[PDB]
Amino acid sequence: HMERPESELIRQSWRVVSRSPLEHGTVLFARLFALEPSLLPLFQGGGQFSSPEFLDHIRKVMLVIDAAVTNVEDLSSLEEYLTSLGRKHRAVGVRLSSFSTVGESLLYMLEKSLGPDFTPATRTAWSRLYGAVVQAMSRGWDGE
Ligand code: HEM
């Protein structure tokens, strides 16, 4: 139940991001790995000593976010998918807490993409949308 003005804040900002999703995705992940560098070895080539490739995984992440934005007014049709996606991440050793770090990284990347256009309402909207995505994913840890 996000109302139209906030929905439109999200849709407009997402269009900006969507001009260059890999570029922006790399910003998100660079911040993520600064906060939680332990995540790196999950990716192909991310270890000092099969696994997803980094840029392909960014495309995937941006496609999930894209589906969330498409469904910003009501995420209900994505719930089963998201729960499944959470299960997948759990199974490979990604802690649920790391999704909070992703959220921080997402807000960072948006701030960088948008500057003053990243209004307080836009930030709050995105926090609520992403929070809802993570809520659905969390079913995967039995950890709602
Ligand atoms: C801490 C952050 C993350 C790490 C370390 C990470 C890691 C991974 C790993 C290791 C896989 C492979 C899973 C497998 O093959 O079974 C994967 C798959 C995937 N991840 Fe992530 N992930 C992260 C966040 C995200 C987020 C936030 C999204 C979406 C919003 C996402 C979307 C995907 C998708 C769509 C797949 C493909 C799943 C499939 O094969 O069906 N990831 N991720």
Side-chain angles (χ1 to χ4, degrees):
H1 52 108
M2 190 164 297
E3 289 170 1
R4 179 179 296 150
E6 287 75 7
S7 291
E8 286 294 323
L9 293 170
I10 291 175
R11 289 165 180 153
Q12 288 154 4
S13 57
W14 187 243
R15 287 186 283 268
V16 174
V17 172
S18 293
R19 283 300 307 129
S20 205
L22 264 49
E23 171 191 349
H24 281 120
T26 301
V27 174
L28 190 164
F29 273 81
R31 181 72 164 190
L32 175 65
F33 293 155
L35 292 166
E36 279 197 48
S38 66
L39 300 167
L40 255 157
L42 295 164
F43 293 96
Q44 181 195 321
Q48 187 184 7
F49 313 114
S50 51
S51 303
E53 327 193 352
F54 182 77
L55 288 181
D56 181 65
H57 176 269
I58 284 166
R59 176 64 65 177
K60 296 179 187 330
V61 167
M62 297 303 271
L63 283 163
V64 174
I65 296 172
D66 191 65
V69 171
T70 297
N71 295 98
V72 60
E73 67 197 91
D74 186 350
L75 209 57
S76 70
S77 70
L78 289 183
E79 252 163 72
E80 193 78 299
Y81 174 77
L82 292 174
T83 300
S84 182
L85 192 62
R87 197 160 44 241
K88 259 203 166 60
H89 283 83
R90 182 186 172 189
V92 297
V94 182
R95 298 172 298 164
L96 191 279
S97 57
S98 298
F99 289 84
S100 298
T101 323
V102 169
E104 194 178 329
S105 301
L106 177 60
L107 298 181
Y108 176 78
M109 179 280 272
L110 291 165
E111 153 217 294
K112 294 296 178 190
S113 291
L114 301 159
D117 290 342
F118 195 47
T119 68
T122 300
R123 181 189 290 270
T124 295
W126 268 107
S127 290
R128 300 301 192 110
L129 177 62
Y130 180 70
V133 168
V134 177
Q135 271 250 341
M137 291 186 73
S138 74
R139 272 195 260 265
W141 281 253
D142 283 4
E144 183 164 47

